[PDB]
Scaffold this active site. Sequence first.
Site, PDB file in Angstrom:
ATOM      1  N   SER A  45      23.287  24.614  42.062  1.00 49.63           N
ATOM      2  CA  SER A  45      22.901  25.999  42.312  1.00 49.63           C
ATOM      3  C   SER A  45      22.424  26.276  43.725  1.00 49.63           C
ATOM      4  O   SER A  45      22.207  27.450  44.054  1.00 49.63           O
ATOM      5  CB  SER A  45      21.783  26.445  41.382  1.00 49.63           C
ATOM      6  OG  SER A  45      22.237  26.525  40.053  1.00 49.63           O
ATOM      7  N   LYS A  48      23.646  29.166  45.945  1.00 45.82           N
ATOM      8  CA  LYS A  48      23.314  30.567  45.681  1.00 45.82           C
ATOM      9  C   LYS A  48      22.435  31.151  46.774  1.00 45.82           C
ATOM     10  O   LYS A  48      22.470  32.366  47.004  1.00 45.82           O
ATOM     11  CB  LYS A  48      22.656  30.721  44.300  1.00 45.82           C
ATOM     12  CG  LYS A  48      23.572  30.361  43.144  1.00 45.82           C
ATOM     13  CD  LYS A  48      22.845  30.195  41.824  1.00 45.82           C
ATOM     14  CE  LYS A  48      23.795  29.687  40.752  1.00 45.82           C
ATOM     15  NZ  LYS A  48      23.107  29.176  39.549  1.00 45.82           N
ATOM     16  N   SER A 105      18.199  31.537  39.833  1.00 47.34           N
ATOM     17  CA  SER A 105      19.423  30.757  39.756  1.00 47.34           C
ATOM     18  C   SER A 105      20.410  31.363  38.761  1.00 47.34           C
ATOM     19  O   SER A 105      21.172  30.645  38.117  1.00 47.34           O
ATOM     20  CB  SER A 105      19.105  29.307  39.405  1.00 47.34           C
ATOM     21  OG  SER A 105      19.894  28.474  40.197  1.00 47.34           O
ATOM     22  N   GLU A 143      31.802  25.320  36.443  1.00 46.70           N
ATOM     23  CA  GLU A 143      32.633  24.159  36.761  1.00 46.70           C
ATOM     24  C   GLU A 143      32.162  23.427  38.011  1.00 46.70           C
ATOM     25  O   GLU A 143      32.389  22.212  38.138  1.00 46.70           O
ATOM     26  CB  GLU A 143      34.097  24.570  36.925  1.00 46.70           C
ATOM     27  CG  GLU A 143      34.782  24.959  35.621  1.00 46.70           C
ATOM     28  CD  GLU A 143      34.524  26.402  35.169  1.00 46.70           C
ATOM     29  OE1 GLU A 143      33.984  27.226  35.945  1.00 46.70           O
ATOM     30  OE2 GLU A 143      34.888  26.721  34.013  1.00 46.70           O
ATOM     31  N   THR A 212      20.431  22.103  40.345  1.00 43.82           N
ATOM     32  CA  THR A 212      20.383  21.091  39.293  1.00 43.82           C
ATOM     33  C   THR A 212      21.736  21.094  38.602  1.00 43.82           C
ATOM     34  O   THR A 212      22.085  22.076  37.944  1.00 43.82           O
ATOM     35  CB  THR A 212      19.275  21.401  38.286  1.00 43.82           C
ATOM     36  OG1 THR A 212      18.066  21.697  38.989  1.00 43.82           O
ATOM     37  CG2 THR A 212      19.034  20.199  37.378  1.00 43.82           C
TER      38      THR A 212
END
Length: 268
Positions: A45, A48, A105, A143, A212
């Site tokens: 993440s 982002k 997230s 994915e 994570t």
Amino acid sequence: LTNLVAEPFAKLEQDFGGSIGVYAMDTGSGATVSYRAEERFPLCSSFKGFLAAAVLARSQQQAGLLDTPIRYGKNALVPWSPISEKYLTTGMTVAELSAAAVQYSDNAAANLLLKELGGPAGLTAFMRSIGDTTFRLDRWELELNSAIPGDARDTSSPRAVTESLQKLTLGSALAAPQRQQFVDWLKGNTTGNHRIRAAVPADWAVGDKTGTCGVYGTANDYAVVWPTGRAPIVLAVYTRAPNKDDKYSEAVIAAAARLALEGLGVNG
């Protein structure tokens, strides 16, 4: 000015059972701490944060972008979309999606914003435009979290993460209003209290973005930290491990951040 003081990163990663990558920059003197800093690690993440910066960069040319309302269907929800699931029936603005992606997230928010930018290649192009030749995003949520050993898709290096973070939060890659908005989103992150923030005294300002993947002991955090009375520090801490079922550790990330600050001589 690199690794003026050695720190026991090797013992830390051995206890963890994997690999830890660290790059930390004292923006005052230019001194750095570096350990496995040019190896690739999965972004998870953590992309982002850069996604939100890319949206802010686009908003410099599109004055109404951040206020634009985005409606989405149930098919846009992705597991772990804690904010966008509450506004499914109403929609959210681009700015709200960006804040959710950074601060919670939020996966549906991240995919909606990726679409706005032209997908993984569009975010990669933004990173190239600020001089980052290492970053690559290749896939969408979820994915992109596969974290396969040796797979360069959806990876960067701790060094390139730190260098790009510095450009966006402290340098000139964004215009000043957008820069401060990016900093403010990072400062408002809710997912990082047990990572770099756990190594940062409560009386210092800090913003961060976590990642994570859920497999291969793979997790990370990057942050800008403002110790009082001296120049800010930018740092990135990435981990991974050899086995698919290896667990990530927030404590190891915090411990690596503490070592980085110690290596820089920043009293904490």
